[PDB]
Amino acid sequence: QMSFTFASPTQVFFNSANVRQVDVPTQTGAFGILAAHVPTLQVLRPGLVVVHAEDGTTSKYFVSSGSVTVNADSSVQLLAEEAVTLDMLDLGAAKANLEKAQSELLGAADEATRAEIQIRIEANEALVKAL
Amino acid sequence: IDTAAKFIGAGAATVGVAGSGAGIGTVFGSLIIGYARNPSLKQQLFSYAILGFALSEAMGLFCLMVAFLILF
Amino acid sequence: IDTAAKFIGAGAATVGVAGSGAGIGTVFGSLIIGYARNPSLKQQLFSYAILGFALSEAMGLFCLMVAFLILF
Amino acid sequence: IDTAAKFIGAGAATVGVAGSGAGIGTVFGSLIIGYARNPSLKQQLFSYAILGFALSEAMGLFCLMVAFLILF
Amino acid sequence: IDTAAKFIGAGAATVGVAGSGAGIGTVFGSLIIGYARNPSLKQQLFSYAILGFALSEAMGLFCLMVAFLILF
Amino acid sequence: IDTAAKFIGAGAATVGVAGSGAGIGTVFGSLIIGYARNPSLKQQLFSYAILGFALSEAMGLFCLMVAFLILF
Amino acid sequence: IDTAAKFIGAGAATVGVAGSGAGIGTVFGSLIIGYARNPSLKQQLFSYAILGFALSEAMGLFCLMVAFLILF
Amino acid sequence: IDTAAKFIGAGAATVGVAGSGAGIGTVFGSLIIGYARNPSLKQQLFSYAILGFALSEAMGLFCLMVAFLILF
Amino acid sequence: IDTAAKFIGAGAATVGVAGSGAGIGTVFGSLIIGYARNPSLKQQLFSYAILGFALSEAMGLFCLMVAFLILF
Amino acid sequence: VAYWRQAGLSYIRYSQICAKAVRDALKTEFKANAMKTSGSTIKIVKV
Amino acid sequence: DKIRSILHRTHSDQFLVTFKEVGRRPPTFGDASVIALELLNSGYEFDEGSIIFNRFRSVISYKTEEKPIFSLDTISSAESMSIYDDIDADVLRNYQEYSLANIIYYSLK
C-alpha cells in the first residue's frame, strides 16, 4: 500500500488514494514508481501520466509542468501547474501552435528568446504523443 | 593430420558461443531494468527483447554451423 | 593424434562456459538493481530472471555438450 | 602441415564472432533500456539501432570472411 | 600424444573461469550500486547478491571440475 | 613448420578483433542511451560517438594488420 | 611432448585471469558509481567493495593455482 | 618448432588487443552518456577521457610490443 | 618442443592482458559517469580512480610476469 | 543542465510557458477556466 | 499594498520588493509565479526564510501562521537528505524553485 496525492492549482484528483504504481514524465525520461519505491525527487516534463488503479482499469492524464515526490515511507504526491485529462484537449489546434512555434525558432537569435520558443515547441510536440 | 586437426579445430569454434551466452545476459538484463522503469511489459519492450536475443544467438547458431562442419 | 587431438580439443570447448558464467551474473545483477527500484519482486521481475538464466545456460549446455562429445 | 594447419587456423578465427555476438546484445539491449525512458521509439532511437547493429556486424562481416578464406 | 594432450586440455578449460570472476564483479557491483539507492541492505537485496554470486560461480565449479578431470 | 604455424598464427590474431566488435556496441549503445536523455543528436554526443567508433576499430585495425602480416 | 605441453598449458590458464581483471574493474566501477550517489563511503558500500574484490579474485587465485601446478 | 611456434606465439599475443579495443568502447561510451547529463564537455569530462584512453591502450601497446618481440 | 613451447606459452599469458585493459575501461568509465553526477571531482571519486585502476592492473602485471618468465 | 538553463531561464519561466501552450490548445467548453487561471494582476514596485 | 503602509515607516530601508493589486482579482498560480520570478532575479541568495499569512478556518475564525521556507539550494542538501538518492545538484535547483511557487500560492489562496 501507498497513499497517492495528485492535483493542480485549479482541480484535485487523488488524496491519499490507494494505488499500486504510477508512471511520470520527468526530466530524466519517464520514471516508474511502485509501492515501496526508493526516495527519489524528480521534476516534471510535458508528457503522459499513467496512474495504475486498484481494479485493472487505468486512468491516464496530460501534464504541462510540475513536480513529483517519493518518500522514506510509502507515500507519493504529484503536482502540476496545469494538468488536464485526455478528454478536453483538441488535436487540431495543437499542430497549429507547433508549426507557429517552429517558425519563430529560426526567426529569433536572442539567447533568451530561443529558449522561450523551444519550450513551446517541446510542449506542443508532446501534444501528439497522446492524441 | 587430416582427421586429427578436425577434432581440435572444432573445439576452438565452440568458444564463439561465449558471445551468444554473455550477450543473452545483456539482452535480458537490460530488459529487466527496462521494465523496472516500466510499464510496457507485453509489447514494445519484451517484443524488442525477442528481436534482440534472435540477433544475439544468431552468432551462436552460425558458430555452431562452423563447428559441425568440421566434425560432420 | 587420434587420442591426442580429442584430448586437447575437449579443452578448447570448455571456453564456451565463460559466456554463460558472466551472462548469469548480469541477468542476476540487473535483477538486483531492478528490485532496488522496487517492488514487483515475486512474479514479473524475479520470475523473468529464470527466463534470463535459462536462455543463457542454453549456450552453456550447448557448449558442455561439445566438450563431452570429444571426451566420450 | 599445409592442409593440416588450414583446419586449426579457421577455427581460431571463428572465435572472433564472440565480439559481434555480445556486441549485438549490448547494442539492442541499450535500445530496450532507452525506449523505456520513452518515447522516440519510431525513428531517432530504433533507426540508430540499425546503425549500431550494422557497425557491430561489420566486425562480423570481416571475421567470417577470414575463416571462409582458409576454407576454400 | 596421450601424456601431452591432457596438459593442453586442462589449460584451455581454465579459460572458462574468465566468466565466473567477471560475472561476480557484475553482480556484486549491481549490489554495490543497488544499495546506494537504498534501503533494503540487511535484507531482500544483499540476500539476492549471495544467490547471484553462487549462480556465477556455478559455472566456475562446473568448469573447474573439468580441469580437475583432465589432470587426475 | 614454416608454412604450418603461420596459418595457426593468423587465426589467433583474428581473435583480437573480438574487442572491437563488442567495443563498437558499447560505444554506439551508450549514445543510444544518451539521446534518450536528449537532445544532442547530430551535435555533441553523436559527433563524439564517431570519435569513439574510430578509437575502438583502430584497435581492430592494429589487430587485422597482424592477421594480414601472418598471411602475406 | 611431456616436458613440452606443460608450457603450452600453463600459459592458457593465465587467460583465466581475464575475468579476475575485468571483474575487479566492474566491482569497483559500480562502487565508484555507488559512492557518487552518496553517502555511506566509510563502511556499508565501500566495505562491501572489499567483499566484492575477494569473491572476484578467488576465481583468479584458483586459475593461477592451475597455471603454477603445470609449471612447478 | 623454433622457427614455427614463435609465429603462432605472436598470434596469441595479439589476443591481448581485445582489452584495449573493448576498453575504449567502455571509456568512450560513459563519456558520451555522461556528457548527456551536461555541460562539462571541454576541460573536465572529455579531458579525463584523454586520461581514460591513455590507460586503456596502454595495455594494448604492451600487447603490441609482446607480439613485436615474437617477430623481430 | 622444449624450445618451441616457451614461445607458444609466452603469447598465451599475453592474452590475459585483455581483462586488465577493459577493467581499466570500466573503472575510468564509471568515474567519467561518476563525475557528471558532481561535484567532488578532486578527491573521493577520481582519487579512488587510481585505487580502482591499481587492483585491476594488478591482474595484468602478474599475467605479464608469467609471460616474461616463459621468455627468460 | 538543459537548454533553458544557461539561456537565462529558471524552472518557473519554464513552467509558465509550458502551461500557456496547454491553455491555448483547449477547445471552447473549458476555455472559461482559462480566464480564471493564468493571473497577472500583480504589480512590480522597485524604489 | 497594506504591508507597504502599515509596517513601512518602521522598516522603510529594509524593503526588497512590493506588490500591488492583491485581493482585487482572485489570486492565481500565475500571480505566485511572478512572486517566484522576482525573488530569484534579485541578488539576494537567502539562507532561509519564512512566509506569514492568514490560514482560513471558518466564516469568523482564522489564525496567523508561519511556514519556514528552506529554499536555499545550499541548505537543500542536509544530513536528512542523505536518506534520499538519485538526485542532481541542479535538479533541486528546479524542484526548490517550484516548491516555492506552490507555498506562495497556497498562502495567497
Q: In the 3-class helix/strand/coil scheme, how is I26-55 assigned residue by residue?
A: HHCHHHHCCCCCCCCHHHHHCCCHHHHCCC
Question: Which of C10, C15, C23 faces B25 most closely, judged by CB atoms?
Answer: C23
What residue of E is the nearest CA neighbor of A40?
E37
Provide the resolution (angstroms). 3.5
- Decide if C22 and E20 are in contact by the 8 Å CB cutoff: yes
Please count the CA atoms within 13 angstroms of the CA of I62 that sit on its side-chain side. 24
Is C39 an interface residue toward A (CB < 8 Å)? yes
**Domain range enclosing A30:** 1-89
**Shortest Cα distance from F5 to chain I (angstroms)?**
10
Query: How far out from the chain centre does Cα A40 lie?
Result: 17
Nearest CA to CA, how far is C29 from chain G (Å)?
11
* Experimental technique: X-ray
Chain D partners of A47 at a C-beta cutoff of 8 Å?
Answer: 39
Q: Helix/strand/coil (H, E, C) string of G2-42? A: CCCCCCCCCCHHHHHHHHHHHHHHHHHHHHHHHCCCCCCHH
Q: How far apart are CA E13 and CA C63, in angstroms?
A: 12
Residues E39/E44/E50/E55 CA torsion (nearest 10 deg): -120
Largest CA distance in chain I: 59
Closest alpha carbon to A2 in A67, A40, A49, A53: A53
- Quote the Cα angle for C6-C10-C16, to 5°: 150
Same domain, A44 and A105: no
Calculate Rg over the CA atoms of chain C: 17
Q: In degrees, to the nearest 5, what angle opens at C-alpha G31 toward C-alphas F28 and H32?
A: 20
Residues K101, A66: Cα–Cα separation, whole Å:
10
- Residues I21, H16: contact at Cβ < 8 Å? yes
- Half-sphere exposure at residue E39, Cβ-oriented, CA atoms within 13 angstroms: 12
For G52, residues 6+ apart whose C-beta sits below 8 A from its C-beta are E24, E25, E28, E29, E31, E32, G27, G28, G31
Residue A35, CB half-sphere, CA atoms under 13 Å: how many? 9
Q: Report how far Cα F55 is from the mean position of its chain's Cα atoms.
A: 8
Question: Helix I58-68 to helix G50-69 angle, to the nearest 10 degrees?
Answer: 10
Alpha-carbon span C1 to B71, nearest angstrom = 15
Choose among F24, F13, F18: nearest CA to F65.
F13
Q: Which residues contact H23 (CB under 8 A, 6 or more apart)?
A: F19, F23, H56, H57, H59, I21, I22, I23, I24, I25, I26
Q: With b meaning 16 or more CB within 10 Å and e meaning fewer, what string describes D30-62?
A: bbbbbbbbbbbbeebbbebbeebbebbbbbbeb
- Considering only the beta carbons, identify the residue of H16, H34, H45 that sits closest to I15: H16
CB pairs under 8 A between B and D: 135
- Chain A residues whose CB is inside 8 A of the F37 CB are 28-29
Q: Is A94 found in the same domain as A47?
A: no
CATH number (domain holding residue A3):
2.60.15.10
Fold exhibited by the domain J1-47: Atp Synthase Epsilon Chain; Chain: I; (1.10.1620)
Residue pair G41/E32 in contact (Cβ under 8 Å)? The answer is: no
Work out the angle at residue F20's Cα, subtended by the Cα atoms of residues F19 and F25, and round it to the nearest 5 degrees: 100
Contact G32, I48 (CB under 8 A): yes
Residue at grid coordinates 566420450:
C72
Rounded to whole angstroms, the Cα distance separating G21 from I63 reads 10
CA-based radius of gyration for chain G: 17
Q: Does G22 touch chain H (CB under 8 A)?
A: yes
Q: Contact at 8 Å (CB) between B27 and B56?
A: yes
Q: Do D14 and B18 touch (CB under 8 A)?
A: no
Residues 6+ positions from G66 with CB-CB distance below 8 Å? E10, E11, E14, E67, G13, G16
Please count the residue pairs, one from chain B and one from chain F, whose beta carbons lie less than 8 angstroms apart.
Answer: 3
Of I67, I71, F6, C36, the residue nearest H59 (C-alpha)? I67
Q: Let me know whether A105 and A94 are in one domain.
A: yes
Q: How many CB atoms lie within 10 A of CB K63?
A: 9
Which phi and psi angles does D41 have, rounded to 5°?
-75, -60
Return the residue matching grid coordinates 604492451.
H62
Centre a 10 Å sphere on the Cβ of residue I4 and count the other Cβ atoms it contains. 21
Q: Which three cell numbers stand for residue D48?
A: 540508430
Contact between B4 and C5 under an 8 Å Cβ cutoff? The reply is: yes
Q: Which residue of F has its CA nearest to B20?
A: F22
CB neighbour list of residue C29: distance below 8 Å, 6 or more residues apart: B29, E23, E26, E27, E29, E30, E31, E52
Q: Is B71 in the E-facing interface, judged by CB distances under 8 Å?
A: no
Closest CA relative to residue H39, chosen from C22, F33, I43, J6: J6
What total number of domains does chain A contain? 2
The sign of the torsion formed by the CA atoms of D22, D37, E52, G20 equals: positive
Q: Which residue among E10, E19, E33 places its CB closest to the CB of G30?
A: E33
Contacts E38 to A, Cβ<8 Å: 38-39
Cis peptide before E39 (omega within 30 of 0): yes
Q: What is the DSSP letter of B68?
A: T
- Cβ pair I14:H40 closer than 8 A: no
Contact assessment for residue H28 and residue F54, using Cβ atoms and an 8 Å cutoff: no
Of A27, A40, A66, the CB nearest to K85: A40
Indicate yes or no: CB of A37 within 8 angstroms of CB of C39: yes
J16: cell is 509558465
- Cis before G39? omega within 30: yes
- The residue among F1, F27, F32, F50 with the most chain D CBs within 10 A of its CB, best to mutate, is F32
DSSP bridge partners of K18: J45
Touch between chain I and chain J: 3 or more Cβ pairs under 8 Å: no
List Cα–Cα distances, A45 to A49, D40, E22, in angstroms. Answer: 10, 15, 39
What angle in degrees, to the nearest 10, is found between the helix axes of H22-33 and I20-27?
Answer: 10
DSSP E strand stretches across chain K: 49-56, 62-69
Which amino acid makes up residue D45? L
Query: Which helix (H) or strand (E) element contains residue A93?
Result: helix A93-104
Mutation test of the interface with chain H: which of G8, G14, G20, choosing the one with the most H Cβ atoms within 10 A? G8
> d(Cα B72, Cα E34) in Å, to the nearest integer?
48
Q: Rounded to an integer, what distance in angstroms lies between the CA atom of residue G40 and that of residue I27? A: 20
What sign does the dihedral C44-C46-C52-C54 (CA atoms) show? negative
A63 and A103 share a domain?
no
Beta strand extents in chain A (DSSP E only) = 3-7, 12-18, 21-24, 31-33, 42-43, 47-52, 59-63, 66-70, 75-80, 83-85
Name every residue whose Cβ is closer than 8 Å to that of residue E63 and which is 6 or more positions away in sequence. Answer: C14, C17, C18, C21, E13, E14, E16, E17, E20
A73 lies within 8 A of chain K by CB: no
Residue F54 distance to chain I (closest CA, Å): 16
Are J14 and A65 within 8 A, CB to CB? yes
Domain ranges (residues) in chain J: 1-47
- Using the beta-carbon criterion (under 8 Å), do D5 and B5 form an inter-chain contact? yes
**Domains of chain B from N-terminus onward:** 1-72 (1.20.20.10)
Q: How far is A33 from chain D (nearest CA, A)?
A: 13
Q: Which residue has the cell 545483456?
A: B26
Which residue in K85, K92, K99 is closest to A38 by CB distance?
A: K85
Residues followed by a break in chain I, C–N over 2.5 Å? Answer: none
Cross-strand pairs, A3: A18, A75
I11 and E CB contact within 8 Å: no
Compare all CA atoms of chain J with the CA of H39 and give the residue at the minimum distance: J1
Q: Both A84 and A131 in a single domain?
A: no
Read off the DSSP letter of residue A58. Answer: P
Count of CB contacts below 8 A, G vs H? 4
Which one of G4, G11, G52 has the shortest CB-CB distance to E25?
A: G52
CA atoms within 13 A on the CB side of K61: 2
CATH number at residue A104: 1.20.5.440
Please provide residue H69's backbone torsions phi and psi, each rounded to the nearest 5 degrees: -80, -20
And the C-alpha cell for C40?
514487483
Chain C, nearest residue to D12 by Cα? C12
| The C-alpha cell that represents K66 in the structure block | 508561519
How many Å apart are CA K4 and CA K15, to the nearest integer? 9
Q: Is H39 on the interface with J (CB under 8 A)?
A: yes
Q: Do chains D and A touch (3 or more CB pairs under 8 A)?
A: yes
Rg over CA atoms, chain B? 17
- Burial (CB < 10 A; 0-12, 13-18, 19+), residue G50, is exposed
Asked whether at least 3 C-beta pairs link B and C within 8 Å, the reply is yes
Give all chains having 3 or more CB-to-CB distances under 8 Å with chain C.
A, B, D, E, G
